[PDB]
Paper text:
Members of the Vaccinia-related kinase (VRK) family of serine/threonine protein kinases are present in the genomes of all metazoans and those of poxviruses, including the family-founding member vaccinia virus B1R1–6. Here we present the first crystal structures of the kinase domain of VRK1 and the first crystal structures for ligand-bound VRK1 and VRK2.
Nevertheless, the most complete polypeptide chain in this model contains an intact P-loop (chain A, residues 22–341; used for the structural comparisons below). The crystal structures of VRK13-364/GW297361X (chain A) and VRK214-335/BI-D1870 reveal that the glycine-rich P-loop region of these kinases can adopt the so-called folded conformation. In the VRK13-364/GW297361X structure, the folded conformation of the P-loop is stabilized by a sulfur-π interaction between Phe48 and the sulfur atom in the thiazole moiety of GW297361X. Ligand GW297361X can stabilize the protein N-lobe via a sulfur-π interaction with P-loop residue Phe48. Another important interaction facilitated by GW297361X involves the sulfonamide group and residues located just outside the hinge region.
Numbering used by the authors: 20 to 341
Amino acid sequence: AEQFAVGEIITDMAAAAWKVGLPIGQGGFGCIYLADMNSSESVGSDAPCVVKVEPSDNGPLFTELKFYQRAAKPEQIQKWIRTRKLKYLGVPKYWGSGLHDKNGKSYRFMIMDRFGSDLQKIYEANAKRFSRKTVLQLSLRILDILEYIHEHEYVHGDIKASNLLLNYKNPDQVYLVDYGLAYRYCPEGVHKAYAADPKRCHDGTIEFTSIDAHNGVAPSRRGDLEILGYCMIQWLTGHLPWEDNLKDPKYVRDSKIRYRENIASLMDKCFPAANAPGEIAKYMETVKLLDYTEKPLYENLRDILLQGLKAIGSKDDGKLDL
Ligand SMILES: NS(=O)(=O)c1ccc(N/C=C2\C(=O)Nc3ccc4ncsc4c32)cc1
Ligand SMILES: [Cl-]
């Protein structure tokens, strides 16, 4: 066994006891096991949690842990859900963390909410397409998530279908994961300058990353919204104009800078035969008007997408249609 014996009892820093289960998949998310509260019974497939574990010196886990401790406390999320009158919030809940010894070496572990399949698998099973309803419903919930993490001094910088996981018991609830390279843009309310972060480089995923990230500057709120824009196009059409040139970041940036200058040209490239949904253009055009340090007007962005739902004879009923 690499880290935890199936059935082992671990106690976190607040003295809460958990039992370890089987590893969850083999994905490039690190070492993850199913977990539950300590009891006589074994941890089965009905496990509500997971234990993510990495060595103490691992920088990304610590950064990820700090974000979870700061912005993902269960009560902190519920207070936001009640005040903003949301059905749920797609920020995974943090249940505790601790240190674990294995063969004289120290490891830090974190207990989190458990999820089922990622969006990418569902997307690939649907022949690399998502309906206008699915895309607009996903996007409204990601705007809820982004407003929350932005209001908590963080930017994600890597929004994509493989970082969007679905609730293990509820298929209409999507969660944004992976904060290993999340960035604290305005610590103690002081916005970061328009320059690189000296400690780490937040490149993201080449196809979806923002122009700011391509320019080698620290990610900001506008960049998270821009990444979401490229996701929406990729989900509706299965393509992006720069998809055959990923090994060249100069090309990807060049293409993005040109397309930001003329959004009608992007709509023309991505949508065949002048069939482009108006709310995508109105959204790209609103994000375009944002300054590096500017607070986005989220409700206005959600209203642009709500107009898109009315155009297809629908309402925000929270149905993902997966
Ligand atoms: N498409 S899939 O079927 O291969 C698949 C992918 C992924 C997972 N599960 C990953 C996680 C899970 O269940 N809980 C958390 C909490 C935090 C977190 N942070 C990065 S990954 C992650 C996870 C299950 C199935
Ligand atoms: Cl295709």
